[PDB]
Amino acid sequence: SIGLAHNVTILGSGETTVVLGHGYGTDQSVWKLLVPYLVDDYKVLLYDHMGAGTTNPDYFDFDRYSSLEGYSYDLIAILEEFQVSKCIYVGHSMSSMAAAVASIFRPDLFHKLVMISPTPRLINTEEYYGGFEQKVMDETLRSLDENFKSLSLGTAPLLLACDLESAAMQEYCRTLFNMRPDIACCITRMICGLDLRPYLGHVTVPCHIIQSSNDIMVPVAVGEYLRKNLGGPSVVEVMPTEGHLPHLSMPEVTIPVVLRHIRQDITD
Numbered sequence: 001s002i003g004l005a006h007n008v009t010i011l012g013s014g015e016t017t018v019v020l021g022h023g024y025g026t027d028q029s030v031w032k033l034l035v036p037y038l039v040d041d042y043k044v045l046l047y048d049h050m051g052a053g054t055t056n057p058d059y060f061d062f063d064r065y066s067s068l069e070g071y072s073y074d075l076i077a078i079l080e081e082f083q084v085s086k087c088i089y090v091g092h093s094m095s096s097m098a099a100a101v102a103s104i105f106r107p108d109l110f111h112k113l114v115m116i117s118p119t120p121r122l123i124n125t126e127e128y129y130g131g132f133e134q135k136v137m138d139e140t141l142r143s144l145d146e147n148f149k150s151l152s153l154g155t156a157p158l159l160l161a162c163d164l165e166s167a168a169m170q171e172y173c174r175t176l177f178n179m180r181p182d183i184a185c186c187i188t189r190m191i192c193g194l195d196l197r198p199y200l201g202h203v204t205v206p207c208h209i210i211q212s213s214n215d216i217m218v219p220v221a222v223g224e225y226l227r228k229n230l231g232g233p234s235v236v237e238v239m240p241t242e243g244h245l246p247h248l249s250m251p252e253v254t255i256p257v258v259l260r261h262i263r264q265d266i267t268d
Contacts, residue, residue: 023092025176053178161243204232208261
């Protein structure tokens with residue numbers, strides 16, 4: 001049953017449901033500081049994507065989770081099982097993109113998407129700057145499996161824009177290293193290879209794009225790219241934060257921004 005498999009948790013109450021979807025290397029615990037500001041006003045559904053360390057490795061299908069679509073279809077099943085519709089979906093990074101793709105198939109399930117640090121593609125082309133070069137990525141990925149921990153530890157302070165010794169680092173590493181290594185490497189390769197650009201013009205539900213001003217995984221111009229290429233309305237807000245997980249590392253700035261986008265619609 002899909003609820004157990006994804007550790008679904010339900011809290012709060014209200015006519016509108018907020019669904020919180022974590023990104024890579026974290027689980028639903030990443031939302032712990034946001035939840036108190038929602039519980040009085042909304043019903044809230046939290047879940048773990050398949051392959052988070054809190055999930056059963058026996059349910060991780062390496063074929064399905066080698067592309068983002070599998071996550072989008074799982075999300076639809078979760079929403080249906082829990083009788084959620086017209087939700088406010090808040091996602092970090094590829095969770096928000098998984099919801100965007102889901103919303104093409106099931107626009108009835110989504111009132112709006114609140115997207116923290118989204119990107120549709122990491123790898124550069126002659127016409128698109130995602131921040132990563134194919135030839136470097138190819139070398140790095142060749143030895144990923146044997147170097148997962150060392151590469152992850154070595155890059156995390158830059159990814160997070162936090163010190164090695166920080167509480168944010170300790171928390172991210174706790175969940176990151178809870179994944180089974182083979183699963184973590186599958187998910188990593190999936191993310192590195194994504195190209196969701198063909199879907200964007202067919203996303204029509206309203207999107208609220210929240211970015212850090214300096215994020216090694218998301219060039220600041222990606223937000224404007226999304227606004228220009230999405231098929232429906234959107235808003236872009238760059239925050240005075242650094243790092244790819246500002247909801248984890250800079251909650252004092254980020255939480256008020258996220259709350260504003262949850263609470264305030266841009267369409268009637």
